[PDB]
Point group: C2
């Protein structure tokens, strides 16, 4: 097993969340299934994938993180902030020799950039 | 952004789920926080991480997948089966030139191995 590849993310609004993940996070189009209301988006070419799945009821917070380089922590924080996203951190994770940034998607999920 | 690094997984029983993720999936010990009832486990050295978080109420199914090599699909299916885990697939994902195996963790989450 080589790492984490994909996560399914429950979203309140497929279009608004697709806009966030593609325009703000820069993920690339994959497969938009307007029938099931799912959108499969690619992370870093073919390195990862998020599957946005529309669900209008029963909200529950999710947490997941994306890998970034330590040297890119401040640029990424600034880029998110410029696009209107509030960013917490950097937070040092001494026990794992890591640095994290924390921010929300449009659904209030707890997203993170982690540098190792 | 280089890929997906970590997912938080809600579990009914921290010990039973920790046993599954370490003994069956082979993830390595990281940080066991018996206070918050969380266990941070490493995937493929430092390539990824799962954070098991005990929650005894409000079950909701999660979906996530781990990256594997295409040539390892049958060995991994067999290995899981040998450890008592029922495996579905391989399923060809033609649109993304991928192959998937599907199986459950002890919480009934929808886990997957994806080969690209």
């Amino acid at each position: 097993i080589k790492g984490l590849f994909e996560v399914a993310v429950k979203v309140k609004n497929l279009e608004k969340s697709s806009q966030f993940y593609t325009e703000i996070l820069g993920f690339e189009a994959g497969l938009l299934d307007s029938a099931r209301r799912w959108n499969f988006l690619w992370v870093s070419g073919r390195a990862g994938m998020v599957v946005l799945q529309e669900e209008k009821e029963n909200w529950q917070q999710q947490h997941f993180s994306f890998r970034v380089e330590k040297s890119e922590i401040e640029p990424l924080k600034k880029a998110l902030e410029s696009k209107g996203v509030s960013v917490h951190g950097p937070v040092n994770q001494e026990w794992m020799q890591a640095v994290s940034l924390y921010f929300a998607d449009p659904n209030g999920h707890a997203l993170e950039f982690t540098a190792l």
